[PDB]
Amino acid sequence: REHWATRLGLILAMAGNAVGLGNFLRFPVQAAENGGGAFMIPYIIAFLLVGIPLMWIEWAMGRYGGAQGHGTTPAIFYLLWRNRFAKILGVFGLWIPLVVAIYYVYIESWTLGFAIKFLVGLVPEPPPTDPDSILRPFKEFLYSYIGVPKGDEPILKPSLFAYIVFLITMFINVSILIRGISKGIERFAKIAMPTLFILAVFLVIRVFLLETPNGTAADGLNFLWTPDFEKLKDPGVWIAAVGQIFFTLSLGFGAIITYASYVRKDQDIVLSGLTAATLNEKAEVILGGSISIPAAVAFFGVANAVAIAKAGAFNLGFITLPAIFSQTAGGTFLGFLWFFLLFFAGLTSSIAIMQPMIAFLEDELKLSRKHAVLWTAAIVFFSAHLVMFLNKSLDEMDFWAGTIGVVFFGLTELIIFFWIFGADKAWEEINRGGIIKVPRIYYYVMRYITPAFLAVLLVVWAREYIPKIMEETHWTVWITRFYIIGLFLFLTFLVFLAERRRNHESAGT
Amino acid sequence: REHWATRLGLILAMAGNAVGLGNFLRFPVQAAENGGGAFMIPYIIAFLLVGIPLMWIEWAMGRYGGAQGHGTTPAIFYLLWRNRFAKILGVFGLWIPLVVAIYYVYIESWTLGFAIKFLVGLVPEPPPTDPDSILRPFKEFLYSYIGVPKGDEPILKPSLFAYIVFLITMFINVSILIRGISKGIERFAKIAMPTLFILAVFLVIRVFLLETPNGTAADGLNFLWTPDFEKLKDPGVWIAAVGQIFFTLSLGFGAIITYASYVRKDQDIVLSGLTAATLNEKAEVILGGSISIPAAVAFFGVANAVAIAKAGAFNLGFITLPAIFSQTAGGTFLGFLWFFLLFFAGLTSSIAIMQPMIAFLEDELKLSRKHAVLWTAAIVFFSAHLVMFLNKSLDEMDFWAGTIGVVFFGLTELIIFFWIFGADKAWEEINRGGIIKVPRIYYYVMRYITPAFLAVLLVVWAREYIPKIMEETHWTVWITRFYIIGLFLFLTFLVFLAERRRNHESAGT
C-alpha cells in the first residue's frame, strides 16, 4: 500500500483536502445569511463538539483500515462491525464523495474558466455609480458562461468555453491522481497550499484597503465578529453552523478516512489531525471571512451585503466580488488572483473527493491505479452532464449528498466506531502512536455529546425543514433523485462483486 | 453449462422467444399503417432475405459460443474476431436486450393488469351507437391505468394497481428464470405455447363471426392480403417491413444467440432455427393478423380502422378491441382471453430478453444463477421507473434499442460472422450437425445480399428520417438518452471487469 512520504506532506495534503471552495465561497454566504457574528458562536461550538472529535475519529478509522489494506467505508465498516448491514451503510462512504465530485469539479472548472478570462482581460466593463449598471455586466457574464435559462424550460446551456474548461479541469485532476498518493497528491499539496496561503493573504490585504462613502472593510469585520446572543436560541442558525463545519472539514465525505488510510499504522494522528483541522479554520475564518464580506460591506454597507449573500450561493463570489474589484486600479488582475485562488482551493479538494472511488477500485476490485483513476474520471465526467444541463440539479445533489448525507454519515461512523466497535477500543485506537493524547474530556464528548448533538440536530432538521422540500419542488428534481439513487445501486453492486472476488480468492489460497 | 433437455422444448422455447407482443400488437398496427396488403410483399421478401438468414446466423453464433462456455456477444464477438473493438461492439448485445426489457416488461404488466380487471368484471360500460360514446370509457380506462398527463407536464401517474401488477409481473419472470434453462424456461414454454395457440385460435374464430352494417371480418382479411404493387416503390414501407421482421423474430436483440448457446455443440440448428422462425410467422400473419384488424374493419370499415391504427401503438389492442368485444355477449370474458393471450405472449418473450444479462453475469462474472437473476431483475425494475413516470420515455427506448439498435446490430453480427470470421467457416459452422442443409443459394444471400440490403436500408433511413427526430423532439428525450447511454457505460465497465477477472484467473491456473 502507498504511504504519505513525509509528515509535512501528510499535513498539507489533509489541509488541502479541507481548505476548499467551502472556505472562500460557502462560509461567507452562510455567515452573512445568519447574522454574521450571530453565526460564529454556534460555529465555534460546533467546531469543538463536532468538528474536532469527528476529525480524530475519521483519521483513526482510516489508519485502522489502511493497516489491513482497506481505505473505504464498505470494508472499514465491516472490519469494525462484522455485519452485512455494515457493508451497505458503508456504501454511503463511496456514494457521497462520488455525488459531490459530480458537482464540485464542475464548479471548480468555472473558477478556472474565470481565471483564464480575467487573466486575458476578456471580461465585462461597467459604465463608470448605479449599483446595478456595474453589477449587471458581471451577472450576464456568469449567466452566459453556465447558460442560465432565459425561458420556461429548466434547461441550462453552458458556453462551449465552459464545456472545454470542464474537460481541462478533469484532465488536471487526473494528471495529479494518476501519479498516486506521495508522487501525486502529496507533491501537489506542497506546492498548492503555500501558493494558496500567499494569494489569500494578498487578497485580504488589498480588500482591507477598500473605503467608500458606504463604509470600510473594517465594517465588514465588525459585522462578522460581533456576537448576537439573541440568536443562540434560533435552531436554524445551529443547523447552518453544523452543516458548514461538516462541509468545511470534509467530514462525512469519506475523504478524510481514505487519506488517513495511507498513514502508517504507528504514525501519529492526534496532533496531525488537529493541525489539519486548525489550518482549515484559520483559512476559513481569517482568510475566507476577511475577503468577500468586507469587500461587499465596504462598497454596499451591511444591509445590502447581507441581501447580496441571500441572493444566491454564487452571487457574491462570481458576480459581486469581481464587480467590486473592477472599480479599482488593476482590478481585473485582482479578479484573476481571486479565481486562481479559488481554483487551487477547489483542485486540492476535488482530488481528495475522487480518491475514495479510486481507493475502492484499487483495494477491493484490484484495479491498477491507472485504470481506477480513469474509470473514476469517466463516471464523474459522464454524470456531470446532468449538473451541466439540468437547472437546479446541482442544488439537488448538494442537498442529498453534501448537506443531509454528510451529517447522517458522520453520526453513522461515530455510532459504528464508538458504540458498536467499542468506545474503549476506539479511544485506544485514536490515541495509539499519538505525539499528544486526546484530552480525557473528549472521551465523553465523543461517546455521549457528539452523537446526541447530531441526533437532535437531525430530528429538528427533519421535522421542521425537510417536508417543505419534498412537497414544494419542481418535478425535475426527480430526474436527479432517480439518477443518484441509481448511482447508489451501482456502487452496491460493486461492493457485492468485491465480496464475490474475495470469496473466490480465499477459496484458492 | 446448462443445455435444453429435448428438441421439442428447444423449439417451443425459441418459438416463445419470438412469438410475442410483436405478433399481436405491433404487426397489426404496422400492416394497417402501411396499406395492409401493400405491407405484405416487402414483409415476405424481408423474411426471406433477412429474417431467415439472420436467424440461422444467430443460432450458429450462439451454439458456437456456448461450446466454449459463452452465451453473450462481448465474448462471442471476441471469439470470432480477436480485437478489443469486438468486445465493445459486443456490448450492444447486452445493452439492447436490457433496454428493451426495461419497457417490454412494463407493457407486459399492463396485459396482466387488464386480464385481472376483465376477469373480475371491473371494466367500463359504454352507453348502448356513437363510435365515440363506446370508445371513450375504454380510452379513459387505459389512461387512468398508465396515468396519461392531463396537463402540460410530461409526467405519467400510474395507478397503484398498475404499479403492484408490474411488481407481480417482475416476480413471475423471476420465478421462471430462477429455475434456469431446462427446468425454468423450457418447462414453461411447453405449457405456455400450446395455451397461447389455443387462445389465439379461439379468438380468431370468434372474430370471424363478427358482422355489422359496416362490414365483416372477411373485409379485414381482404384488406390485409390484397397486394398493391404501386407501393413496392415506397422506401418507408420497406423500412417498416424490415423493422417488423427484426422485432418479430427477436433478431438483433442478442436473445436468440443466448438461447442457442444452450444447444449442444453437435445438435442441429438448421431445421430447428427454420422451424422456430416459421412458427412465429404463422402466429403473426395467421393469428395476429386475423384478430385485431378484421375486428376493427368489421365494426368500423377499412378507412376508420386504418385511422385507428395510425392513432397510436396501443389504441387498437388496449382500447378498440376490448370496446368492440364489449358489444357482444360474453365480450368481457373475451376481453380477458385476449389480455391473457397477450400476457403469455409477453411473458415467454420477456424471459428471453432478460436471459442475456443473466448469462453474462453467470458466464463472465461467475455469479450464481440466483444472484444473476436477482441483480438483473433489480436493474430492470429500478430502470423501469423511468418508463413508468416520464411521458414518451418508452417511445425513446423503443426507438434507440428496439428499432435502430436491432437493425444496426444485425448488420454488425453478420459482418463479424460472415466477413471477419470467414464466410466459409461461418457457412460450415451453420451447417454442422444440420438435419438438413441450408440451400446453397443462401450462401450468397448471407454474404452479399443481406448485408447490402440492410446497409442501403439504414442509409436511406438515416438520410431522410432520423434528422427530423433529433431536431423536432421535446427536451425531455435527453433524460432517457442520458440514462441509457449511462447503461451502456455501465455494461462496458462490467465487460472490463470480466476481462480483469479472466486475466487474474489465468495467472493462477
Ligand SMILES: CCCCCCCCO[C@@H]1O[C@H](CO)[C@@H](O)[C@H](O)[C@H]1O
Ligand atoms: C459523455 C456524454 C455526452 C452526452 C452529450 C453531451 C453533448 C455535449 O454537447 C456540447 O455541449 C456544449 C456545451 O453546451 C456545446 O458548447 C457544444 O456545442 C456541444 O457539442
Ligand SMILES: CCCCCCCCO[C@@H]1O[C@H](CO)[C@@H](O)[C@H](O)[C@H]1O
Ligand atoms: C483555454 C483553452 C480553452 C479555449 C476554448 C475556446 C473555445 C472557442 O470558443 C469560441 O470562441 C469564439 C471567440 O471568442 C466565440 O466567438 C465563440 O462563440 C466560441 O464558441
Ligand SMILES: CCCCCCCCO[C@@H]1O[C@H](CO)[C@@H](O)[C@H](O)[C@H]1O
Ligand atoms: C442529463 C444530462 C443530459 C445532457 C444532454 C446534452 C445533449 C447536448 O445536446 C446539444 O446541446 C447543445 C448545447 O446545449 C445544443 O446547442 C444542441 O442543440 C443539442 O443537440
Ligand SMILES: CCCCCCCCO[C@@H]1O[C@H](CO)[C@@H](O)[C@H](O)[C@H]1O
Ligand atoms: C467541548 C470540549 C472542549 C475540550 C477542551 C479540553 C481542554 C484541555 O483540558 C485539559 O485536558 C488535560 C488532559 O486531559 C487535563 O490534564 C487538564 O486538567 C484539562 O484542563
Ligand SMILES: CCCCCCCCO[C@@H]1O[C@H](CO)[C@@H](O)[C@H](O)[C@H]1O
Ligand atoms: C422524470 C420522472 C419524474 C416523475 C416524478 C414526478 C412526480 C411529481 O411529483 C412532484 O414531486 C415534487 C418533488 O417531490 C413535489 O414538489 C411535487 O409536489 C410533486 O407534484
Ligand SMILES: CCCCCCCCO[C@@H]1O[C@H](CO)[C@@H](O)[C@H](O)[C@H]1O
Ligand atoms: C426503486 C426506485 C423507487 C423510486 C421511487 C418510486 C416511488 C413509487 O411511488 C409509488 O408510485 C405508485 C404509482 O404511481 C403510486 O400508486 C404509489 O402511491 C407510490 O407510492
Ligand SMILES: CCCCCCCCO[C@@H]1O[C@H](CO)[C@@H](O)[C@H](O)[C@H]1O
Ligand atoms: C391482483 C393483485 C393486485 C391488487 C392491487 C390492489 C391495490 C389497491 O388499489 C386500490 O383499490 C381501491 C378499490 O378498488 C381503489 O379505490 C383505490 O383507488 C386503489 O388505490
Ligand SMILES: CCCCCCCCO[C@@H]1O[C@H](CO)[C@@H](O)[C@H](O)[C@H]1O
Ligand atoms: C426517472 C423515474 C423517477 C420516478 C420517481 C417516482 C417518484 C414517486 O413520487 C411520488 O409519486 C406518486 C405517483 O406519481 C405521487 O402521487 C407522489 O406525489 C410522489 O411523491
Ligand SMILES: CCCCCCCCO[C@@H]1O[C@H](CO)[C@@H](O)[C@H](O)[C@H]1O
Ligand atoms: C431469396 C432466397 C430464397 C432461397 C430459396 C431456396 C429454395 C431451395 O432451392 C433449392 O435448393 C436446393 C439445395 O441447394 C437445390 O438442390 C435446388 O436445385 C434448389 O431449387
Ligand SMILES: CCCCCCCCO[C@@H]1O[C@H](CO)[C@@H](O)[C@H](O)[C@H]1O
Ligand atoms: C435533462 C437535461 C436535458 C438537457 C438537454 C436539452 C437540450 C435542448 O435541446 C433540444 O433537444 C431536442 C432533442 O434533440 C431537440 O428536438 C430540440 O430542438 C433541442 O432544442
Ligand code: MET
Ligand atoms: C470537495 S472535499 C469537501 C469540501 C471541502 N472541504 C471544501 O471546503 O470545499
Ligand code: MET
Ligand atoms: C421481447 S423479445 C423481442 C420481441 C418479440 N420477438 C416480440 O415479437 O414481441
Ligand code: NA
Ligand atoms: Na474547508
Ligand code: NA
Ligand atoms: Na482544497
Ligand code: NA
Ligand atoms: Na414475434
Ligand code: NA
Ligand atoms: Na413470447
